[PDB]
Amino acid sequence: QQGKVYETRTVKSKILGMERSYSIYLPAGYDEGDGSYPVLYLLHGLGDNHTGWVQFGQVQYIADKAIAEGKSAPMIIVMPDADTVHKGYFNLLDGTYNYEDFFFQELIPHIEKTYRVRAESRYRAISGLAMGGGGALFYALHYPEMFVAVAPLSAVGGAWTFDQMKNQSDLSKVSEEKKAEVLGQMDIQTILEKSPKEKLDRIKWIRWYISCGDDDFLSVTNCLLHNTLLQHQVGHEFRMKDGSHSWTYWRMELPEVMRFVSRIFTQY
Amino acid sequence: QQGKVYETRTVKSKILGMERSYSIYLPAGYDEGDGSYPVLYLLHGLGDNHTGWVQFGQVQYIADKAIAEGKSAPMIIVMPDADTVHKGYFNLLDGTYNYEDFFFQELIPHIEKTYRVRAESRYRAISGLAMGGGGALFYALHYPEMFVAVAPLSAVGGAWTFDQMKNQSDLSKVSEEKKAEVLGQMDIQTILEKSPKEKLDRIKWIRWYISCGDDDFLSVTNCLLHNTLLQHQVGHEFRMKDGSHSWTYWRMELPEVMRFVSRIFTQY
Amino acid sequence: QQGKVYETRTVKSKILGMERSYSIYLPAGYDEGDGSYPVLYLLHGLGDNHTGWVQFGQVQYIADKAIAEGKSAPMIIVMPDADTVHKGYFNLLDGTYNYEDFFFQELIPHIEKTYRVRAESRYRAISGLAMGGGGALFYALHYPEMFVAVAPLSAVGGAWTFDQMKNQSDLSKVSEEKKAEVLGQMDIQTILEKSPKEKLDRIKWIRWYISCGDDDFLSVTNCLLHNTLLQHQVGHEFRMKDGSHSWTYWRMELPEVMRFVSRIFTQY
Amino acid sequence: QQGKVYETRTVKSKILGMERSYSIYLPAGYDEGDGSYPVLYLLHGLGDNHTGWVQFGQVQYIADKAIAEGKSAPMIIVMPDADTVHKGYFNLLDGTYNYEDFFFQELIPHIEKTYRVRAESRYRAISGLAMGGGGALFYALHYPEMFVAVAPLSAVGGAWTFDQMKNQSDLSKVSEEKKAEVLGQMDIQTILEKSPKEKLDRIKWIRWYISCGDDDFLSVTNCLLHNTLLQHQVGHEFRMKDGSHSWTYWRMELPEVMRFVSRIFTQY
Amino acid sequence: QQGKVYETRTVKSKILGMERSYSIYLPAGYDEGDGSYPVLYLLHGLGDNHTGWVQFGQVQYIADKAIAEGKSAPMIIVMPDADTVHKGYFNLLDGTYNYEDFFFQELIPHIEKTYRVRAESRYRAISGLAMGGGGALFYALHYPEMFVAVAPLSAVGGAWTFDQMKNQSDLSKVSEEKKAEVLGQMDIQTILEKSPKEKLDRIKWIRWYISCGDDDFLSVTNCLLHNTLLQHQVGHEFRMKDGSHSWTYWRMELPEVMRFVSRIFTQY
Amino acid sequence: QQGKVYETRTVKSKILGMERSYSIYLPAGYDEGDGSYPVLYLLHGLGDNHTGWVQFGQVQYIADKAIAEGKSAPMIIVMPDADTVHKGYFNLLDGTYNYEDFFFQELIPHIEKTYRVRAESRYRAISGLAMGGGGALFYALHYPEMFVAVAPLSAVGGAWTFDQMKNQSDLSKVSEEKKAEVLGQMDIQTILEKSPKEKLDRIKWIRWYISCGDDDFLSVTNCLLHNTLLQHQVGHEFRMKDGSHSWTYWRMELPEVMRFVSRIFTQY
Amino acid sequence: QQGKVYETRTVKSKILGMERSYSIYLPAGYDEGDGSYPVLYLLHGLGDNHTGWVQFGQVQYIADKAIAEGKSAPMIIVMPDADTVHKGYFNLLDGTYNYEDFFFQELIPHIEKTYRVRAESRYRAISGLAMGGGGALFYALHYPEMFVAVAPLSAVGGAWTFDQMKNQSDLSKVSEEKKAEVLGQMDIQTILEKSPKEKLDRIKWIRWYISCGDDDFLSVTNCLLHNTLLQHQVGHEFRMKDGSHSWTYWRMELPEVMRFVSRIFTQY
Numbered sequence A, B, C, D, E, F, G: 001q002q003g004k005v006y007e008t009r010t011v012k013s014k015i016l017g018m019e020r021s022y023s024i025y026l027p028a029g030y031d032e033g034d035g036s037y038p039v040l041y042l043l044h045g046l047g048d049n050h051t052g053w054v055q056f057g058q059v060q061y062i063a064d065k066a067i068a069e070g071k072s073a074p075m076i077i078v079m080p081d082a083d084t085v086h087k088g089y090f091n092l093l094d095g096t097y098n099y100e101d102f103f104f105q106e107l108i109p110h111i112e113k114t115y116r117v118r119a120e121s122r123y124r125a126i127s128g129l130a131m132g133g134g135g136a137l138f139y140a141l142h143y144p145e146m147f148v149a150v151a152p153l154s155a156v157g158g159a160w161t162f163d164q165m166k167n168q169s170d171l172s173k174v175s176e177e178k179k180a181e182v183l184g185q186m187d188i189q190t191i192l193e194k195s196p197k198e199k200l201d202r203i204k205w206i207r208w209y210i211s212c213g214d215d216d217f218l219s220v221t222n223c224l225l226h227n228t229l230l231q232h233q234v235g236h237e238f239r240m241k242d243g244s245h246s247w248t249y250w251r252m253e254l255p256e257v258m259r260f261v262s263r264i265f266t267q268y
Ligand SMILES: COC(=O)/C=C/c1ccc(O)c(OC)c1
Pocket: A046, A087, A160, A163, A164, A165, A167, A168
């Protein structure tokens, strides 16, 4: 019936020079047997931290329920802290805080070393809300070879995030050529035009689930996102449901995301 | 428990010079008591006729169920034939087939004279799928004072419809001034910009429900519609659900449209 | 299991010099057997008429459901039109439109003459919403011998009602002496203080059910009403539920009202 | 699915010079994982002590049920003893028994030190019945920066509370200037008029839930409370349900209070 | 809601020189409204007549139940008599009894003239068991333009059906050159090999549903049927379920057959 | 009531010269009491290994559910790895990898030594999908005295398996005489033709359950298999259901397989 | 969900000079937390002992069920042995066996010292069947200050009990003065007539629940009991249900008795 959540553990980070918090959900029966589990990475929005999906998202109750009902297979859920010191998911322009490198080169290997994890792309999915939707969306466009499924909920656009990366950086130390380079790497249109054939095929191979409420100011951002993906022939599932920019929407979508990624993990 | 459907009745049209077919759904208890009912106009798509919402849409079973369960209050459903002679809902460019004039000046008054109908805008709503979604959309943008609720399902765009009016017309007799004028009356951007305040207020006061499946080729048209409406401050409900250009989608949506318009008929 | 509604029947009034509309709900089985039924008079709000409880209140579906479930015993529901010519339930101050006289001397005797009605006080109740809630409240305070139960929903106060009576009157024909007298007859504090013992006792014998939503602008009016009745030792049931000034509130309250008066008609 | 209750633990009070009893409810799964929880302070009425909400309120069964069904998120419930030595929640006028200082400077820090509590305003709510309803009400009017939600049930008034503080004080040592000072601090009208703008805004930011039975002698006090709050534009949810001054009323409201505060803890 | 069955009606047949019996199931509500219905032709097995699907198949109960639950749309079910005079569905080789001619030239037009039928191939399906399963299959391979859906249940093969045609014939009147041709028209391998592209494509457009129990002596014939169709790229739905050559098997498949054809009639 | 899965335990093979992986499912309550269990050996398909039925087949959830509902009696499920070094279940022709000998002489004795197993043929069954369906089928045809029930799901044929033995072997060291010898040992027709009466009788005593989806490319293989068994009077259960070569099909059949073998273990 | 029963524990009795057996039901969760519980003393009938309510009454299942459903709050149930040495609940007339004194001075204090019991009259109730109905009835009439609720089931009368006390005694050492005094102390009419105002008011404060089946030989005794209590204005609930002198009756009443006493323990 019931799994458990740890909120106070950390990963020793040399790239960020600190102990980084994360939360982790372990499914019921993680402590019995010796088997391993797939992992869902679940990213919070602006203002919250690694307790957001725990306290507001009610991840323990919602995942316990979905797994016991058979709506989802057992999985591990990992919730990073992207609020302490700097807010956001990407490497800053001044070179002083490379959070994206921390995620792929330190957090993911730590999870695989510490917990009983199936450590392959086919067992790794990523999702998030608002700021974390943009995080999940662009993590997968940068490293499509790391994920099998991606689920941006109420996702911010590339322009919003690049604005956050500039406001968070010391712009006196950043040249104009470097601003132009990262601006292009945070634009969904430019990434798809400039991707080599191998990259674009991995992007088409990823299973995408993109959802947003219709009374959300981000509905326009996500309708433009849907049109861009069809224009580049990236098949995906797209939902615009009754809802707003609120935790009512995200607690309702969480079991849908789990059912979506769980079927990819188990195949069908 | 059970209402009834008549498929074979006609209305004698002076504008079109012929008897025009329609099907009509009367709710259960229509023959008991003396009260009157609100009306939903339900328009078919390209290739089908007045039997379309009857045979494919299964209107009798679905409305019988929604009304018996209380999801919808009792109402009349009218399904006009827009297939015979010429296909489409609008006046052709050559002046030989003014179907839109027929709808508003002959069909609606005939229904209100023949059946026990509450003959007011506050009790009159319109919906349709594909070609009929574009019909419901542009019928309401032309005569916004005529409806309280409008529900385009998988609706075609204005450019698609204007192309249909050209194909069906004798363009040898049509001047370039008329071609340019009618295109502007079939463009939603243009109508909203050229409307006086009294007209634009009535368009915002209409309660809109716009729904389309994500695996439909029209999903892009309807996402662009959602953006255009927001840009002009037309509040509306927008849904993009899992589904395609098929009768599974429209039979799923029919009881939603009925609950949507029923709450407006009864207030809430 | 389905009853029926007549909307188009009238009653010939000498007091008002015209045919006055009413609506009537007859329970299932009215046309089999020869028995008689109690009556609930159900009053609409300002701007609406005798169709209001039919179309907005959905009286037919709600009454059919409550009687078939046994939540209520079978009863007749009468819905008078207090909208045509003048809006309101009371005698105008200029003497040209004595609606309250019509209600008690012509409508109530007519209903008892035309339909199979148990014509005693113990089988007659009155209820209404907003304007009609104030109507029901003061109809019973003026003629307490006429009802066994009274249920004001979201009721306006006497001050609101008196103000509305003046606007509809030709105040050139009205003396200040009559204005002060009528003001006192539309004030609950005055009526309870100035009633002889015989009248005040009948007021206490009536079973009162007073309900209003907390997000209603009339919530303060109805809280003051609860305090006044307690201050004069008039027992009543009082409900302030989650809700607003809406037909969602009043369609919810109709089955509670029907269970309330039904239990009094049948005893317990 | 079962949590647990501790009744026999105490807090060592420097202010009251004794070990002070409290009861605490820990939710299911409190022992597994390392996370923290929000806290609801739940105050008993006159005559009961820290065992009242346990034995009469049946907090363990009711909270176990609401949390397992998902009607509430997991929370900690703390039940202070306000009966031993003196009955009541406030500082006595003679200076020998400052229970209110005890509550805020000793009990709240003790809970946050001893249990895994999210120790912020946004994760702290307070509720109580009768005497404790007034206690919850005026604790929050005195220290509004401490709470995010307040739920007085069948609450006693400000005058009743000030009367208790006097009967419980030795008045020979009490000056007349102080009596008038505390009289004003235990009056809601006085507090709302005389609070500076920063306090008054914080009172409006709190989420209020006020409930009382219609057959309670205190129904008048709480209806006057409803009117006073609207007069000062402090929005709140107000309920007057069928019920009396009884543990039937309070056992029914306990899960409604839990759902109310839980939605505030989790956001929506 | 119950439909009805007529057993005793006949069609006056010039080809067979007699009145031919049939049974017909008309759905609930056939006698209200004026609409039309699709038709399922339902063929009995050897030894039975037009009462077989009525008395043994229990078509009234099964069709009333499937239609009311919404598992199937309303349809007409026609059950021809192929037992009187001679047993079988095909023209006997001696030219004296052209039952296949009777079915397509007299029975189908008579049903369409007498009942409210949608008279098009897109609204016409055929099914049967054993002898009638072979009948449905070879009717559709001979006249593929007549059906949209075909459902042989526990069908006999072409050789068994041809052998029955010989044994019932007067061989004094049979030419051997025609006998050899008809043997080839009653062999599925031969029909598909000899079909021109227009015929072969129409056969692939028909929707096939082939079902047979695994404990049936005919399971081998129907597995070979499945192998032949795939060898010729005729996509179809094939079911081998637990069951025998019995009315337990056929009563279970009848609602499955109805759901299969209903969705094709209504589209999806 | 939850059982448990072990994935990381091995068996020391003298025949294969390495530690060989397997997974094992132990039912709930295996750790209470001293009783013994029957065993189902469950073989994966090509490309997966011993975690395939665990991660994709979800054996833990599906077996936990079937046993708790009583659809199946408690049993042990053993899932061997036939992927490492060489893919497949049979002895290679070059003599370097005799996997079939390993299975019967090392793996089965190890399970019976290590876990509480009823070590008799009447308590031993075998099943699998695709490559593993052929494994189960030909494992049972070679040593039929080892199993009481066999369940090939979507099984490959013997020719498919013989092709795998050739492609996986170094054929330079293999004589033509040996190629002909094993070819005959991997053909179902040949095995049944040459079996002595004792072997043939035990094959008929085995209870066979053969299931395949109709939209699977292997459906022709299994229809031919059904025909072959009937020609040799090998009674069996045969199912052809709606489905493809997918884990939806195989997760659906696993509880059907468990119910089938459980009923044989317990008798009926 | 499940509590537990101890049958083999004993109280060391100075009054009876021996270890006395009792059985005890502890509710689920007794071993978690530190809280205390109310106590129901539950007395057996003639012939049974402290195992009677356990084996025949099935108290463990019935109390587990009533408490888990919330029909009763958790309580401790103590079942004393009144069978060993002498049968009955009262002091023998010869002074050699003061069973009633043992009950009040040794059994009740031992329970409160040994288990976590709320040791006040308001948390103490008594019930019993047959002989134990008379015991519970007359214990409460003798020591009314000890109980808050009393529930005699199918109770014997005082005359029967006094007959039991004599037959169990050595009457040669008992004077006629003691015989007459005890007869009056075991008669319900006499106890109520001679009780001072302090005792009679506590008798009226106790909540009584007296139940007996209609086909029971004691139905007449308990009808007279109902008559006696009413004549002295002792309010009580009285039930005469279908049933006999059997454990079907007493197993039916046990959850009613638990609900009755629970609501007194919790208030309502
Ligand atoms: C319009 O785009 C934006 O302004 C993005 C908001 C934003 C940007 C950087 C931050 O560090 C931050 O944290 C408070 C918020």
